[PDB]
Amino acid sequence: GLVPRGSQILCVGLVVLDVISLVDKYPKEDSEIRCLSQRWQRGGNASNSCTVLSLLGAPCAFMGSMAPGHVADFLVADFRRRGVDVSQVAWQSKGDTPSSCCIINNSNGNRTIVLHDTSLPDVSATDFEKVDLTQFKWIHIEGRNASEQVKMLQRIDAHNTRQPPEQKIRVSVEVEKPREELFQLFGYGDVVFVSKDVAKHLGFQSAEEALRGLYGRVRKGAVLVCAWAEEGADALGPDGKLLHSDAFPPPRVVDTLGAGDTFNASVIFSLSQGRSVQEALRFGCQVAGKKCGLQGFDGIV
Amino acid sequence: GSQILCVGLVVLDVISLVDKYPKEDSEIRCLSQRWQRGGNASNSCTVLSLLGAPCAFMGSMAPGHVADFLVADFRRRGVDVSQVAWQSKGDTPSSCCIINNSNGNRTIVLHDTSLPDVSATDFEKVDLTQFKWIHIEGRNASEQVKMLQRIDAHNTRQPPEQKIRVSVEVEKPREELFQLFGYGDVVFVSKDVAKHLGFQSAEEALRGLYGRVRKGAVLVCAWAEEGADALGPDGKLLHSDAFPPPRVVDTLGAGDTFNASVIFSLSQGRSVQEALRFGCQVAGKKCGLQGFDGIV
Numbered sequence: 001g002l003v004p005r006g007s008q009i010l011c012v013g014l015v016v017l018d019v020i021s022l023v024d025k026y027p028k029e030d031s032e033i034r035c036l037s038q039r040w041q042r043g044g045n046a047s048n049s050c051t052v053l054s055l056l057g058a059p060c061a062f063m064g065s066m067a068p069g070h071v072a073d074f075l076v077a078d079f080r081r082r083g084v085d086v087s088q089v090a091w092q093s094k095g096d097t098p099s100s101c102c103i104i105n106n107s108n109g110n111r112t113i114v115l116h117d118t119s120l121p122d123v124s125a126t127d128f129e130k131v132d133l134t135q136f137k138w139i140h141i142e143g144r145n146a147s148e149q150v151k152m153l154q155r156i157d158a159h160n161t162r163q164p165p166e167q168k169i170r171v172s173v174e175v176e177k178p179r180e181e182l183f184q185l186f187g188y189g190d191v192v193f194v195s196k197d198v199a200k201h202l203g204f205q206s207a208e209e210a211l212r213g214l215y216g217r218v219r220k221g222a223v224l225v226c227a228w229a230e231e232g233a234d235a236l237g238p239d240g241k242l243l244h245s246d247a248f249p250p251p252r253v254v255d256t257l258g259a260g261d262t263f264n265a266s267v268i269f270s271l272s273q274g275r276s277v278q279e280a281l282r283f284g285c286q287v288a289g290k291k292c293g294l295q296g297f298d299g300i301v
Numbered sequence: 302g303s304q305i306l307c308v309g310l311v312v313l314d315v316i317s318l319v320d321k322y323p324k325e326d327s328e329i330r331c332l333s334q335r336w337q338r339g340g341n342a343s344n345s346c347t348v349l350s351l352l353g354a355p356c357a358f359m360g361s362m363a364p365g366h367v368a369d370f371l372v373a374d375f376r377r378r379g380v381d382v383s384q385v386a387w388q389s390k391g392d393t394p395s396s397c398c399i400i401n402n403s404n405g406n407r408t409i410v411l412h413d414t415s416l417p418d419v420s421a422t423d424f425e426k427v428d429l430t431q432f433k434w435i436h437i438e439g440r441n442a443s444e445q446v447k448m449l450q451r452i453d454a455h456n457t458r459q460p461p462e463q464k465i466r467v468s469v470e471v472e473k474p475r476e477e478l479f480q481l482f483g484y485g486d487v488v489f490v491s492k493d494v495a496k497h498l499g500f501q502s503a504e505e506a507l508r509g510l511y512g513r514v515r516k517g518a519v520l521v522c523a524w525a526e527e528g529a530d531a532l533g534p535d536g537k538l539l540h541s542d543a544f545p546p547p548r549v550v551d552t553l554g555a556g557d558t559f560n561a562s563v564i565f566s567l568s569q570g571r572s573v574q575e576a577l578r579f580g581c582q583v584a585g586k587k588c589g590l591q592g593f594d595g596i597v
């Protein structure tokens with residue numbers, strides 16, 4: 001139906017069906033064992049950020065690859081359940097909709113993961129060329145297929161060029177996996193989110209070290225953001241003033257799965273609402289903190 | 302008396318095909334993913350259907366989007382879902398299956414959804430005149446014995462020409478299930494049940510457990526790559542070497558393929574030797590393929 005002009009936040013990236021099983025002891029190959037509990041969860045960075053923005057009170061839309069089937073059916077119903085607009089999905093004729101199987105040992109708490117197959121093609125620049133951008137006030141891209149995502153990001157810059165400053169689409173990028181191909185995405189977006197893993201792999205031993213060491217890579221006037229678990233988060237703008245927020249840990253830590261995604265979405269939300277980078281770092285840390293003492297995303301606000 | 306009835310589980314098998322079994326706390330990526338209609342009695346229905354045998358499934362199912370897929374698989378196959386004991390409380394069971402492509406080993410992490418099992422009450426509603434054979438997957442032993450007694454009673458009232466052949470499977474090493482040994486013309490005992498009783502071969506297990514079977518019953522024990530063995534009233538051991546494929550890619554449901562093919566051959570009046578041999582034959586073809594298409 002009718003989405004008002006420049007009203008939505010779009011998240012471009014991965015959706016996956018995570019089957020999570022809790023077991024007494026790790027299964028030995030060729031065995032038939034019974035789990036304590038089993039959960040079917042909708043995962044993926046851009047998918048999780050959508051759930052959060054819906055819960056935060058934001059009209060939001062997801063854009064990722066899915067193949068028609070029963071896995072896609074569960075995921076779409078979950079998106080819809082979290083009030084996410086699913087009309088921009090790139091429906092693929094060939095490939096398997098991602099599904100990862102996870103095994104949690106009730107004993108040592110260790111996570112054994114069997115990642116989804118590579119069969120499904122990622123969203124292309126041509127798939128993206130087809131999108132009428134006027135309904136989006138902000139577009140967020142989870143770095144995956146950088147070459148292609150660069151063309152998408154050039155398109156938003158092109159769109160923006162012919163628009164008044166009050167009708168310009170704000171853009172954020174996320175470099176979460178420590179893969180070389182992605183490091184070119186640093187040059188795009190008004191807000192750049194770099195992870196602890198990417199920073200550590202690049203050498204940096206802290207968020208100040210990362211932000212001071214990678215700010216050169218950003219486009220003129222961009223804000224480089226880094227969350228460092230318990231150390232809270234830092235942000236660095238074009239003024240050179242390193243901003244910081246201490247973490248807001250929960251009384252006890254329940255589930256940290258999707259905490260960075262909660263951080264990203266909350267920062268995007270705060271900025272989209274006209275708040276300062278400092279007000280936004282604080283908001284992000286408050287919400288990502290509340291989430292960690294919760295099972296899933298129910299009651300994060 | 303035409304159809305073959307299978308009593309037991311139906312489970313959604315969420316399959317991931319790996320090149321090597323994952324190490325604890327590791328993070329491997331699978332080659333392919335698939336959903337499959339699992340559960341022992343359900344797998345046996347796929348096989349019987351494929352062998353051209355009119356069959357039916359009776360098991361507990363919760364209406365939903367999972368069961369809708371399962372029923373669409375049964376229907377695509379030709380399995381009579383009419384006897385499904387539909388429940389209201391709970392969800393349909395589901396399992397995570399890691400299939401090692403290199404050797405075909407299958408690791409199953411099962412989620413049993415508390416779904417109430419098919420009871421003697423559900424079974425009394427069944428018209429036993431359409432059935433040629435009845436196979437029961439050892440689950441609620443005390444409850445299934447009542448279902449078995451009901452079949453013997455129908456048999457006493459019928460000529461040897463129109464009697465129902467009955468087969469039982471004891472797959473899990475649960476002491477409740479040993480009562481089933483017990484009933485039925487054919488009794489399938491798994492290698493894992495046999496090992497859990499101190500037996501180190503299919504021949505050992507048969508010589509040991511035969512005393513526990515109904516008078517005139519055939520006790521059958523498959524032993525993976527070591528083939529299968531059988532023992533009847535005559536006290537003569539029957540053996541069948543296996544039919545391994547050059548490259549073993551999927552052992553998920555091989556035992557159910559064996560059981561169903563053994564039932565199929567016997568239902569068609571072939572000797573226990575021929576049936577043993579056919580079971581190994583079909584279980585072998587299946588191990589070289591992913592799933593069940595192309596086993597015939």
Ligand SMILES: O=c1[nH]c2ccccc2nc1C(F)(F)F
Nearest residue numbers: 525526544545555559584585588
């Ligand atoms: O691995 C196997 N598992 C079986 C399980 C039951 C009956 C026959 C089987 N054959 C094989 C194989 F050796 F032929 F492949």
